[PDB]
Structure formats: structure tokens, C-alpha cells
Design a protein around this ligand. Sequence first.
Ligand SMILES: NC(=O)c1ccc[n+]([C@@H]2O[C@H](COP(=O)([O-])OP(=O)(O)OC[C@H]3O[C@@H](n4cnc5c(N)ncnc54)[C@H](O)[C@@H]3O)[C@@H](O)[C@H]2O)c1
Ligand SMILES: NC(=O)c1ccc[n+]([C@@H]2O[C@H](COP(=O)([O-])OP(=O)(O)OC[C@H]3O[C@@H](n4cnc5c(N)ncnc54)[C@H](O)[C@@H]3O)[C@@H](O)[C@H]2O)c1
Ligand SMILES: NC(=O)c1ccc[n+]([C@@H]2O[C@H](COP(=O)([O-])OP(=O)(O)OC[C@H]3O[C@@H](n4cnc5c(N)ncnc54)[C@H](O)[C@@H]3O)[C@@H](O)[C@H]2O)c1
Ligand SMILES: NC(=O)c1ccc[n+]([C@@H]2O[C@H](COP(=O)([O-])OP(=O)(O)OC[C@H]3O[C@@H](n4cnc5c(N)ncnc54)[C@H](O)[C@@H]3O)[C@@H](O)[C@H]2O)c1
Ligand SMILES: CNC(=O)[C@@H]1C[C@H](NC(=O)[C@@H](NC(=O)c2ccc(Cn3cccn3)cc2)[C@@H](C)OC(C)(C)C)CN1C(=O)c1ccccc1
Ligand SMILES: CNC(=O)[C@@H]1C[C@H](NC(=O)[C@@H](NC(=O)c2ccc(Cn3cccn3)cc2)[C@@H](C)OC(C)(C)C)CN1C(=O)c1ccccc1
Ligand SMILES: [Mg+2]
Ligand SMILES: [Mg+2]
Ligand SMILES: [Mg+2]
Lengths: 268, 264, 268, 249
Amino acid sequence: TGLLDGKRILVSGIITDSSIAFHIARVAQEQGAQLVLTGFDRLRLIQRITDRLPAKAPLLELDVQNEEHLASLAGRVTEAIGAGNKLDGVVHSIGFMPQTGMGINPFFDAPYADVSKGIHISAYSYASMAKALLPIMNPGGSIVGMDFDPSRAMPAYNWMTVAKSALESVNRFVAREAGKYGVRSNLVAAGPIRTLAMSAIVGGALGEEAGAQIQLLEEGWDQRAPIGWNMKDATPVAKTVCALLSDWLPATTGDIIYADGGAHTQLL
Amino acid sequence: GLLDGKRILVSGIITDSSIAFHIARVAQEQGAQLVLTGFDLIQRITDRLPAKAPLLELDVQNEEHLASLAGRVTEAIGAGNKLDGVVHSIGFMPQTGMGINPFFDAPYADVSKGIHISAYSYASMAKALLPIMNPGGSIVGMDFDPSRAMPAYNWMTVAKSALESVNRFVAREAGKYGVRSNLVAAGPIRTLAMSAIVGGALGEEAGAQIQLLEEGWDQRAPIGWNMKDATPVAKTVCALLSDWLPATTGDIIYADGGAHTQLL
Amino acid sequence: TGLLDGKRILVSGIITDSSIAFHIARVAQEQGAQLVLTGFDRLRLIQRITDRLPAKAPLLELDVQNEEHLASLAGRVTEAIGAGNKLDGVVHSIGFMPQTGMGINPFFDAPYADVSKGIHISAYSYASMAKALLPIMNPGGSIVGMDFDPSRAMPAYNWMTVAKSALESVNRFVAREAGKYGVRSNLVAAGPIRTLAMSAIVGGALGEEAGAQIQLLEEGWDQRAPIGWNMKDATPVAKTVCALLSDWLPATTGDIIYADGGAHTQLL
Amino acid sequence: TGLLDGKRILVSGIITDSSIAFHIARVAQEQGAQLVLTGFDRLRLIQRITDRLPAKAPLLELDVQNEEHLASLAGRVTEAIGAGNKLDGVVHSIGFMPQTGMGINPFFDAPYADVSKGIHISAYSYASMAKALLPIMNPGGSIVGMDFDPSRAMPAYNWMTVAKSALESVNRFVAREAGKYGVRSNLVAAGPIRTQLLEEGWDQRAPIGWNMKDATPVAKTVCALLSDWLPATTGDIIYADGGAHTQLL
Ligand SMILES: NC(=O)c1ccc[n+]([C@@H]2O[C@H](COP(=O)([O-])OP(=O)(O)OC[C@H]3O[C@@H](n4cnc5c(N)ncnc54)[C@H](O)[C@@H]3O)[C@@H](O)[C@H]2O)c1
Ligand SMILES: NC(=O)c1ccc[n+]([C@@H]2O[C@H](COP(=O)([O-])OP(=O)(O)OC[C@H]3O[C@@H](n4cnc5c(N)ncnc54)[C@H](O)[C@@H]3O)[C@@H](O)[C@H]2O)c1
Ligand SMILES: NC(=O)c1ccc[n+]([C@@H]2O[C@H](COP(=O)([O-])OP(=O)(O)OC[C@H]3O[C@@H](n4cnc5c(N)ncnc54)[C@H](O)[C@@H]3O)[C@@H](O)[C@H]2O)c1
Ligand SMILES: NC(=O)c1ccc[n+]([C@@H]2O[C@H](COP(=O)([O-])OP(=O)(O)OC[C@H]3O[C@@H](n4cnc5c(N)ncnc54)[C@H](O)[C@@H]3O)[C@@H](O)[C@H]2O)c1
Ligand SMILES: CNC(=O)[C@@H]1C[C@H](NC(=O)[C@@H](NC(=O)c2ccc(Cn3cccn3)cc2)[C@@H](C)OC(C)(C)C)CN1C(=O)c1ccccc1
Ligand SMILES: CNC(=O)[C@@H]1C[C@H](NC(=O)[C@@H](NC(=O)c2ccc(Cn3cccn3)cc2)[C@@H](C)OC(C)(C)C)CN1C(=O)c1ccccc1
Ligand SMILES: [Mg+2]
Ligand SMILES: [Mg+2]
Ligand SMILES: [Mg+2]
């Protein structure tokens, strides 16, 4: 008797067992969901990671910049879940911005080709995934994407923050389209999580200044959060995504739920 | 159920159309053990709920009621037991501050009474109940998006703006106990008073204003909005009372069909 | 040839020469405005302060909690500016919250009588002043109130922050009424300024913790502000109020202009 | 004795005499500003439009998608305003989104190449212009961009609304960089200007009304930000929309 019993859910964005999508997939399976997973480029490496999940799940290739992958996606998902079956949930947990657009590089020095690639993968692809999958979604369905509150500028995140601002706007338009199918579309704005890349930057991969900037940003988050914030723990974020995938927020769409310890509601 | 074994206090039941009646019904269906509070007929309404629940008197303007509340709740749930959830579903604004009366004609005594009951009491209830709440607990209040001005709601909208600010401060206090505090901003629901205003209780003008506001709500909402159905709102409150949004506090969840995210 | 040449403007809220209203009045006069001033309770003391302004201006008594003062206000202003003349501008620079609702006192320990008095003076009175003065305002006129960004909770400001959230809502309703007269209504959200009460709290009037909290808040403001923030300087705030009183923002109403060094737009 | 007396201001985005930039340029000149104008592609056609302004102003070519135009811009402006002189103001009044990403075309049918072009011109270029011009801006200077409130989704505007959400974020980062030079960066979010149901709703929501045929209130707001009268506002958005965004109905 789990929160997502009988639900068929697609989960994108697993690359390591530290990926937010790995924790979303794990919690959904613990809650009785039947998953279809999508991975990018390193499929053999992703399969070894997905073997660590509590249950077996088919793994499909999906490069969001690849038009052929998007055009064939619904058919490939239908084959994996069986003809006559449709999805109840879709999780977009995909984000990318080259090092020229986030980190140490000055905001003004990011070339447009890099920013454009980052926006394609991080924001436009939320619309691409909804376009491909809405024709195979059941009424009462739910599409969830991952966000990082971009309402105020911050050091280092730079063009990734710009990509999140675009993503929030894209989510509002996706909700208009999804509504026609009786499907909700929402974003979960998470606090900072120490995923593979974040641990490296903290360790000094981008130098002394970038490491210090991320450290000050994270410490401030746990300080502002009335219930605190654990950057090593994606479980509260995964649970929030599962709450939106469930039947328990049936009147919320085109919206943003903050799984950030309440940090964004406090100044100091 | 979603709330199996949880001990939850629910305030604000007056009729079986009250948002709190639907919150209480859904919470019991989901395995919660309730304590109810009423302001005084309520007993006859609460007898219509799926399960028996003790009913305590609570006038939020009454200092003695607030000072004795924790002790009275402890007696009802048994010594050694604490609350996991608290629902504030209390709102009031005299007709001089809400409806047909011009915005400038509301006397301060009426506005102040409305703010005391609709906003300040969220802090009063948290103060009284936090000492008897378990870690991982949840306090939820009812909101109506006041980010933009609208016809007729007038000083009630002002009271909701104050409530949203109060909720952010309540979260700071609640955090010390490992407790969350959040508001559910609902779309319009046809509760006893709303049905009367639509029927023409406040006249032709006020009835037409509320109707236009509602018609707009369903057209803006990408998934539509059913003003006669409180169940999506009750479910959202239960989602916040559950362990499934454990990192959300001082915040607002919109159970409005997504209307607030669309211009037209 | 000033920004406010020939404009008749009412300015409330002068108590000391550090009052934001004193600086608003000084800048307005430097810019060619003809003022009417209102003072609360200590009129003889206020007259000694207003004698320090560049030009003479009549001083009227106004306690916003006094119904008789509000009912007679328009007639008293008309007598001061001459029959057949009307106001072009109104400045609300009035705020109050008892120490039980702001400072060291726990948020939960503020009695409602104190909170209600603070809301009456800080938020409801913005509507009271508009009701009294709109019948004696010219088209193209402007009503301006003072705000402190209450979108996020902060230590020590407690119930004063709640009062500002109410004020922002009141301003949006005042704009609906003012629009009928061709008059704009807006708030200026200022950064922290060391005025009478704020200087005392910093000095330790509410104890060590309240003083330390305000100090940390002010320091954070200057670091977040891309152009910095000088808490001892009310001139940038006074200039912003004068910009709203001018004919240069003719399509802005029910709104909030931030004179805070841009601090509210930055996380760190 | 105008609002912008002695100020040297660059104004981009004039294409017709109904362009918001034309009205910004006209009001700035009426207020004593000395202008430098930039135009895209149809320079001969733009020059004839700029001749309609009250005063003469040099016209420079600027395609924001052209890296060479951006790299040479500061030097070309300095030559026009004379050596030893710097700008006090910069106006970005540039926007574009292909018809596949706007109007009638379904939101899902806009190819990424079109959306990317729209974002490059409408959002990224605000950063490009600031990068090129900040080294030739005076302290107390002001950069202003044109915005359309994208906080809520609306019919037809689709990917242009997405581009404005990106622009708002870009403006907040530009303010961080501009602050180092003592320069402010802000956007003016305007109501609809005729350069129908959505536009009709605006006038009824606006407490002071909204005239879609009149760009002068928008031009005046931009001039207010270019002046010394909002010296503590940066990374922000000023709404010149009749107050429509503050009202539900
Ligand atoms: N880690 C945090 O602090 C944080 C905070 C808030 C939100 N988020 C967001 O959560 C999501 C997941 O990020 P994460 O932190 O788990 O990092 P991650 O690196 O583990 O996951 C990002 C995923 O994006 C995938 N991806 C990149 N390019 C792709 C393409 N062309 N096609 C398909 N997939 C592609 C990667 O393969 C990877 O699986 C992102 O949207 C991210 O921005 C992260
Ligand atoms: N459309 C809507 O109905 C709507 C929309 C959004 C939010 N809400 C909010 O939901 C909440 C519940 O409203 P409702 O629509 O269910 O109406 P309701 O009339 O059924 O409930 C209001 C409750 O407040 C109680 N109350 C009033 N004064 C009190 C006092 N002094 N002490 C204690 N309790 C007191 C009343 O007894 C009543 O039970 C309110 O906060 C309301 O503003 C309602
Ligand atoms: N100082 C800051 O950091 C700061 C920041 C943002 C906004 N503000 C706001 O600016 C405004 C002016 O405050 P200030 O900082 O200049 O301090 P202040 O003490 O100089 O001004 C407050 C004024 O309100 C008046 N007032 C109080 N009760 C009144 C009543 N019953 N009737 C009429 N007038 C009454 C006082 O007499 C005084 O002149 C207030 O609205 C305040 O909240 C101040
Ligand atoms: N018209 C409205 O309703 C409205 C509302 C709010 C904001 N705005 C904004 O105001 C600005 C001006 O638009 P407008 O309404 O005056 O229309 P417009 O068509 O007159 O101006 C847009 C300008 O962008 C220029 N431009 C396009 N591609 C360019 C490139 N590659 N390099 C340089 N410049 C380029 C065009 O040449 C033109 O001068 C835009 O940012 C627009 O989004 C307009
Ligand atoms: C000029 N006024 C006075 O001398 C005194 C200071 C008194 N102030 C207060 O009671 C309290 N102060 C305040 O009420 C207060 C007012 C404005 C600010 C400025 N601000 C910053 C952010 C937002 N607003 C700050 C505070 C109290 C928290 O301050 C003490 C501890 C310094 C006393 C109000 N006064 C009154 O006389 C008074 C009396 C009755 C009604 C209203 C005012
Ligand atoms: C200088 N302008 C011109 O003469 C033409 C109009 C052309 N406009 C567009 O393609 C499109 N227009 C637009 O891109 C467009 C630009 C600005 C606005 C103003 N605005 C309103 C709300 C918010 N902002 C509105 C629209 C397209 C949606 O419009 C058609 C259907 C009228 C063609 C771009 N132009 C170009 O030549 C052009 C070509 C390549 C790149 C950039 C501009
Ligand atoms: Mg903390
Ligand atoms: Mg609809
Ligand atoms: Mg829990």
C-alpha cells in the first residue's frame, strides 16, 4: 500500500547513484511505482547504477538534443510498458551548463553556443519531453521537473540560473498543454545537493574561489532554513517529487514546490 | 492511509460545507485520530464525520481559551501523547470590510477584529500547540492568494497578506520543535456564505462580481476549477500534514487549478 | 527649474532631522515643491526640526488614530494652500510597532492590542490618508508610502514585517480608488536607515541579541547590494520618493519601487 | 534645463517611428540628452526614421548576433562622442522571436534553432551590450532594457514570454557586473504597445487605464531610470503598465 501503487512512471536523469533522479526512482519503487528509465550517452555505465535500485526497470536511450530520440520515445515507452498501457507520471531531472557559463568563468565570457546548449538541455527539453509523452499519458497524470530558485542572482551559478528562469516560464506553458490531457505539470525547486560535480567543486576542482563561493552559499542555506538543510541528503527532495506524482496535490499545476528547508522564505 | 496513527487538531468546522469539515473527513479516511475545535450546533455537524472525535471550545479572541488549550488537548489524547498536526481553517471579516461596502468605509475596529481572527490567530494557535507537538509535525493554515487586489474581497485580502507574513515567522518558531508551518492557497469554494452572495444576499453588483471572479478562475486554470468541490483542497492540506513534503516550510502551496500561474 | 516646480505636496512623518520624511521634504523643496507638513503629538518640538528645512512650510497636527484629525484634514490643508488650490502629492512616512512586537521580545509574546495599534498606524492609515486627501488632489497626482520589503521573514523586525505585508496589500486597493481621480499610489521599499528607533535598537535599547541581529542584517544589505548600501544616508531614498511625486513615472500605480541598492535582487 | 541635460546616451532598437526606442530617443532629446543610435540590418531605412527625431544623432550598425560588431562597438561609440568622453546611459530596446515561437503556432511546434535565435537577440544580447559598453560608461551611469511581464503564462506570446523570463534573470547578473563601475541596470516592463482580448483586459485591470497606441508613458519611465532620480535601484524591474499587473480583475 504505497503512495504510487500501480502508477507507471518514466524517470530521466540518472547518471550516478548520487543523481537526484536515482533517489526519485528509488523512493517511487519503494512506493509501488512501475518505472521506465531514460539515460544519456553512457548507457552501459547507467545500467550498472540502475542495477542498484530496489527493482528492475527497462532503460531507454534519450538524448534530449536528438530529434530522432524524441520522435521515437513514445513508441519505445509503449513497447516497454505494453500496448494499451499509458504513463501516469514523467520526471525530468536533466540539467547541463558548460563550465564557460557556470563556475569560475566571468558571466560576460560565456559564448552564446555554450549558453544555447545549456538552455536547450536544461529548459527547452522540458517542453520536448512533454510534447513526446503527453499523447501516452493518462488523465490525472503528472509531469515533474527539477528547479533551483532563480528569482535572485547568485555567485558562480550564472547562466545555469538564467536557464532555470527560462525553465520556470516553460513549465507554465507546458501546464497549458498538459491540462488538455488532464495532466498536471510542476517543478520542484530543491536546495543545494552534493551530487558528483558539486562534491568536486567543493574539493577544489575549479580552484580556491569557486570552492569558497559554493561553501558560503550552502552554509547560508542551512542557516536560513527554519528546519535546516542537509546538502548530502536527496531523500526530502525525492519524497517531494513523489508527492507531486501522487493523487495528493490534484489541483496544483504550472507551479513550483520548494523542497529547500524553507530557506527561500527567510532573509537571514 | 496517508496519515495512519497521526494525531491531528482541526479547527474551523461550522457547517458540513466548511473547508475544515472536508479536511477532517479526508484525514479520518486516511487513518488520522482527530481533536476538533469549534467557536460558539457544531457537535451535530461533527457527528456526520466518519469517526468520533473530541470537540473542544476555542474562540481565538479568548486569551483564557488559548492558555488552557494545550492542557485540554493533552486530556483528550491522553497523558504521554502529543499532536503530529494542526489545521487552522479560521477566517472572518465583517461586511463593512468585505463585500459591497467601499474599501475606504471599513472602520478600524472591524478591520482589526478581522485581522485578529484571520491572521494573528495563526501565531496564537502555534504558540499554544507547539509545546505539545512531535518532531516531524505540521501546522497548516488556509489562504486566498492576495498578491493582487480584486473587487469585493477588500480587507479580507489585506488580512490574507498579513497571514502569509505571519506564516513565515511561525515557521521560524516551529523549526525549533522540528515542525513545519505552511499555507494552502485555495481557489474559490462555495461555502454557506459564498452561495448566499452568489444568490444575491449582498445585491446585484456583489453577486455579479463574485460570479465574474469564479468564471475567470475556471477559464484560467489549465486543469479547470470546480468551486462546488472542496476535496482537492482537503487532499492538499493532507499532503502537507503527511511525511511527503518534509523540506517545505514557511511556504504556500496553491490548490487553485493552477489559475494563479496564468494571465488569460 | 526643479523636478517638482509648482507642485503642492503634503509630507507626513517628520520627528527628527534623521527622519526619512525630513530628507523627502528637503529634496522636494530643493526641487521647487511647495510643502504642507503634518506632525504627530510633539508639535512644538517638530516645528524646531522643520525650521531647519530650506523653506518655510505650514505644520498641521495629524494623529492617524484620531478620527476628528482625519475628518478635518482636507479643510485644514485647503486653508493652508488657499481655496481653489489642490495637492499634487501626498507622502505617508508613518510607521510604528510597540517593542513587544519588534526587537528582543519573542514573536509569540506580542499581545494583539500592540499588534493592532502597529497595524492601524503602519498600514490602515495609508487608506485613511488617501480617503481624506483624494477629494483635494489634482489629476496626475501622486500618493507615496514608505515600505520595508516583507516578502521574506527576518530576525527582530517580527510584527513590523507583518504590518508592511498588510501595507503592500492596502497600497494595491488605494490605487483602485486613486485611479478614479487620475492619481497614482505607490510604495518606496527602502533599505535600512539609522532613524530614531533603529539607532536606539543598534545602540542596545532592546538588549545585546536584538542589536547584533540588526547589525548582521545591515552588513548583509551592503554586501548583497551591487551598488552598495549606506545605512546613514537617506538621500537616495528621498530622491526615489521625489521621482514618484514627479511626472516621470506616469504609468506606475499600486506598485513598489525598491530604493535598496538592489539588495533584494541578490541572494549573496 | 531638462531631466537628462548633458547626458550622453546610446539608444538601440529603432526600426519604425512607432518603435518604443523612437519615443525613448525623442523624449531623451527633448530632455537635453546627446544621443548615439544603433540599428540592425536596414540602416538606410533606419537613417530616414532617425531624421524624424528633434535633433541630429550619429547612427551605428549593431547586429547583436555579430561578434565583430560587439567587439568594435565601444571604439565606434567613443569616435562618435569624441575621445575622452564616456556614456551616461544605455538603452536596450531589442526583441525578436520567429513566428514559429509566437502567435498562432502551437507552443510545442517551435524548433529549438528558432527559440535559440529568439533568446540570443532578446535576452543574451542584454549581457553582450553591457559587456561591450560598461568599459566606456561613467560612474552614476544607467543601463535600461525593455521587458513584458512574464511571471504568468499567456496565449500567443509563448516563447517570447520564455525569452523575457530569461531577460529578467540576465538583468540581475548584469547589475552585479555594472555595480563594479558604479552603474545601475534595470528593466522597464511595459504594457502592450501597437508597434486583442489580452490587450483589452489590460486597460480594464489598470487603475489609471492603459492606452496601447501611446508609447510616451513608457518612454518617460525609461528616461526616469536614465536620470539621477532613482540612484538606489538596480537589478530591478519598473512596471510602466498602468498598474495592470497589481490587479486580478
Ligand atoms: N544538485 C543540486 O544542487 C541541484 C539543485 C536544484 C536542482 N537541481 C537539478 O536537478 C536535476 C538533476 O541534476 P543532479 O544534481 O542530479 O545532477 P546529475 O549530473 O546527476 O543529473 C543531470 C542529468 O542530466 C543528464 N543530461 C545531460 N545532458 C543530457 C542530454 N543531452 N539528454 C538527456 N539527459 C541529459 C545527465 O546525463 C544527468 O543524468 C537538474 O535539472 C539540476 O539542475 C540540482
Ligand atoms: N472560497 C473560500 O471559501 C475560501 C477560499 C480560500 C481560502 N479560504 C479560507 O478557508 C478558511 C475556512 O473558510 P471556509 O470557506 O471553510 O468558511 P467557514 O465559514 O466554513 O469557516 C470559517 C471558520 O472560522 C471560524 N471562526 C470565526 N471566528 C472565530 C473565532 N473567533 N475563533 C475561532 N474560530 C472562529 C468559524 O467558526 C468557522 O468555522 C478561512 O481561513 C477562509 O478565509 C476560503
Ligand atoms: N528606517 C528604516 O530602516 C526604514 C526602512 C524602510 C522603511 N521605513 C519606513 O519609513 C517610514 C518613516 O520612518 P523613519 O525610519 O523615518 O522613522 P521615524 O521615527 O523618523 O518616522 C516615523 C514617523 O511616524 C510618525 N507616527 C507614528 N505614529 C503616528 C500617528 N499615530 N500619527 C501620525 N504619525 C505617526 C512618528 O511621529 C514619526 O514622525 C516608516 O513607514 C518606516 O516604517 C523605514
Ligand atoms: N510592443 C510591445 O507591446 C512591447 C511590450 C513590452 C516590451 N516590449 C519590448 O520592447 C522592445 C522593443 O520592441 P518594439 O515593440 O519597439 O518593436 P520593434 O519591432 O519596433 O523593435 C525591436 C527592435 O529589435 C531590433 N533587433 C532585432 N534583431 C536584432 C539584432 N539581431 N540586432 C540588433 N537589434 C535587433 C529590430 O531591428 C528593432 O529595432 C523589445 O525588447 C520588446 O520585446 C514591447
Ligand atoms: C518619534 N517617536 C517617538 O519618540 C516614540 C518612539 C516609539 N517607538 C517604538 O515604540 C518602537 N519603534 C517603532 O515603532 C519603529 C518605527 C519605525 C521604525 C523604522 N523601520 C525600520 C524598518 C521598518 N520600519 C522602526 C521602529 C520600538 C520598537 O522602538 C524603541 C525600542 C526604540 C522604543 C514610538 N514613539 C512615540 O512617541 C509613539 C507613541 C504612540 C504612537 C506612536 C508613536
Ligand atoms: C526589424 N524588424 C523587421 O522589419 C522584421 C519583423 C520581424 N518580426 C518577426 O519575425 C516576429 N516578430 C517579433 O519577433 C516581435 C518582436 C518584438 C515584439 C514586441 N513585443 C510584444 C510583446 C513583447 N514584445 C513583438 C514581436 C513575428 C512574431 O511577427 C510577424 C508575424 C509580424 C512577422 C523581424 N524582422 C526582421 O527583419 C528580423 C530578421 C532577423 C532577425 C531579427 C529581425
Ligand atoms: Mg537554520
Ligand atoms: Mg481552464
Ligand atoms: Mg513527518
